[PDB]
Amino acid sequence: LVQLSRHSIAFPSPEGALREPNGLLALGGDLSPARLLMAYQRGIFPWFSPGDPILWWSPDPRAVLWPESLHISRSMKRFHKRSPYRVTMNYAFGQVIEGCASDRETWITRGVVEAYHRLHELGHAHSIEVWREDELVGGMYGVAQGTLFCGESMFSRMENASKTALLVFCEEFIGHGGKLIDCQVLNDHTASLGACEIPRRDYLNYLNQMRLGRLPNNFWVPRCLFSP
Numbered sequence: 001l002v003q004l005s006r007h008s009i010a011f012p013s014p015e016g017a018l019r020e021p022n023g024l025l026a027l028g029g030d031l032s033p034a035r036l037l038m039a040y041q042r043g044i045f046p047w048f049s050p051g052d053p054i055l056w057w058s059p060d061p062r063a064v065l066w067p068e069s070l071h072i073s074r075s076m077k078r079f080h081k082r083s084p085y086r087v088t089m090n091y092a093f094g095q096v097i098e099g100c101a102s103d104r105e106t107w108i109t110r111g112v113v114e115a116y117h118r119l120h121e122l123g124h125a126h127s128i129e130v131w132r133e134d135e136l137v138g139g140m141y142g143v144a145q146g147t148l149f150c151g152e153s154m155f156s157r158m159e160n161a162s163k164t165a166l167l168v169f170c171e172e173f174i175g176h177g178g179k180l181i182d183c184q185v186l187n188d189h190t191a192s193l194g195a196c197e198i199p200r201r202d203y204l205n206y207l208n209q210m211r212l213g214r215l216p217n218n219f220w221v222p223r224c225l226f227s228p
Contacts (some may be wrong), residue, residue: 004029004056009038014058014204023059031056031115033056033122038051040150041211043204045184050109060200063186066149067170067178071194072163079160080167084130085138087226093120093127096139108153116152126220128169130149130161137161140169143157144220147179147213148206166193168226177215180206 002012004026017025020195025044031054039045039056048055072080097116101108119125120141128137138161140154156162173181182203183195 002026004015004035004054006030009035011038011042011044011056013119013201014043016048016201017058017060019060023057024055026056026070027053029056031111033115033124034117036115036119036143037124040145041207042104043200045150045152046112047107047184049107053226057184058200058204059185061197062200062203063183063190064198064203065181065183065190065195067174067181069194069196070166070170071192072167076160076163076167078165081165083226083228084132085158085161085164085226086133086228087165088129088131088222088224089172090120090126090220090222092136092139093117093125093141095136096127096141096155097153099139099157100141102194103155116141118141123220125141128165128225130156130158130165132158132161138165139155140165142182143209144215145182146211147177147184147215148210149173149178149180150182151184162189163193164226172225176219177213179210179213 007052017178034219044056046056058224097113116125125139129136137158138156141196142149142151154162183190186197
């Protein structure tokens with residue numbers, strides 16, 4: 001491996017990551033906006049349980065999701081056509097990440113929250129919210145990397161809340177140039193939604209191409225995406 005330094009925002013080539021644990025590449029450093037941005041630019045992300053030092057990753061393969069391949073069951077389509085939810089973009093970044101943090105009775109520590117909150121404040125991290133009237137019932141947040149979106153996590157406090165968030169986002173994302181969504185690691189729910197695994201070099205390749213891409217100037221301003 002390799003320990004980072006408070007000095008620079010330099011990162012070692014992802015290809016020198018460990019095989020097991022898959023993707024472990026470096027430790028230390030900090031969660032400053034600059035260091036974080038660089039992490040994503042180069043296909044790396046932080047992940048570590050509270051108590052441990054900062055750990056950075058770039059797994060092989062990488063879980064990803066082609067927006068157009070999002071699988072939506074027939075029961076969900078029925079649900080979404082008569083949806084009881086409203087979806088918004090960047091209305092409550094803080095609550096969404098907190099919602100993702102309080103899930104599972106998670107590594108999302110206060111420090112991590114502030115760090116991504118800074119990125120949101122600076123205009124790089126964004127959130128999708130799912131509301132059951134006045135209540136935030138689900139959502140997802142991530143870091144925008146051009147036409148590629150790096151999804152950190154999502155949460156659901158009501159049936160189909162997160163499915164709705166993803167469904168609505170993919171429609172809005174594709175409609176304006178969105179090309180790929182990064183899922184980091186593949187999990188059961190994510191896989192059922194059509195997420196798949198591709199080689200790390202394929203992902204980095206895509207990343208380098210898409211970072212350059214641009215969505216419309218206002219794509220990320222706080223707004224209502226879906227309100228039946």
